[PDB]
Every structure is written in structure tokens, then in C-alpha cells.
């Protein structure tokens, strides 16, 4: 199971993560899982 998550704070952290990952368009790790 999972604990109660705050939609407000949850979205805040999510949006932030997207920006950070967005900064790296080319990631070797992506190709690793992609092709596998």
C-alpha cells in the first residue's frame, strides 16, 4: 500500500523534477533501458 500523498506538494516536487531532467535531453541511461 501507499501513504496519503498531498496533491499540492506532490505536484510541486514533480514539476521540479521534470525541469531538472528536462535540462538533460541526451542521457546514455535512457538508451540503456530503451534498447536494453
Amino acid at each position: 500500500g501507499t501513504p496519503e500523498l498531498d496533491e499540492d506538494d506532490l505536484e510541486a516536487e514533480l514539476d521540479a523534477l521534470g525541469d531538472e531532467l528536462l535540462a538533460d535531453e541526451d542521457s546514455s541511461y535512457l538508451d540503456e533501458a530503451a534498447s536494453a
Partner: protein, 163 residues
Amino acid sequence: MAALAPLPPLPAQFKSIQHHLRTAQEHDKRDPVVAYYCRLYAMQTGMKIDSKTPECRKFLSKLMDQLEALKKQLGDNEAITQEIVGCAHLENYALKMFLYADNEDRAGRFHKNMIKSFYTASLLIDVITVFGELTDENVKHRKYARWKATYIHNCLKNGETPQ
């Protein structure tokens, strides 16, 4: 197959789909099937969010044009013509990515690469919904992926080793 020109500056009003577009750009080369459906999500989400402001109207027009051209490029493609195989393929792709992260999760190996896997997997699920399906099972996974994505990320900032 060919690479289309990049889209003009993307306003903040589309920050939500901003990531989706970038994902398609990458998948475009690796696989146009995912990128194609990805673009569809953007257009559908774009109109849902707004549909006015000369900036948006024009943006949607450009996006739509790219979608039409892309479909033509592929021609038929069982993945495009037959949504049956296309959908099934998308489901498998998301599963492989998720399982991969889950495999390393229990293995006791956490890293930024995995964090992307969970988040990226969430984006894939969204691309699946556009089909109109999406069962509760997938929804549960989405909730877990989002939670696990932030849980690990939040803990990282706090300076704590995942568990």
C-alpha cells in the same frame, strides 16, 4: 522517414506538455511510433488547456501540421494503421521500463537514472490513455510511479539513502 523542423519557443502555458514534446523528440529517432502518439497527446492536451490567444492558436496549427506530415511519412505502419498493435506495443514498452526500475529497486540500487525511468514511465502511461482505455490497474501504477519518483527525489535532497 525524415526529421521535421523544431517548434517555435514554447510559452509557459504549455510547461506541462513541454516535457512530453521533448520526450517525443528523442523517441522520434529511436522510434517514431511512440513519438507519433506522443505528439497526439500534446495536441489533445494543448486544446484542452486553452484554444485562444494568437500564440496558442498558431502553436496548435503548427503542431497539427507536424502530426499530419508525420502520419504521411510512415504511410501505413501497423503501429499507426492498426491501433491494436500500436497500443499493445506501448503497453509492453511501459512495462519493460517500469520492471527495469523495479528490478533495480529491490536489488538495492538507487540512482538518478532510475528516477528518470519511473518518471518517464509515467509519461508513457499518459500516452496510453489517449487511446481511451486505461484500467484502474494502470492508474495504481501511475500513482506509485509518481510517488516513487518524488519520494526518492525528495529523499535525495534531504540527504537520505532510499529504501
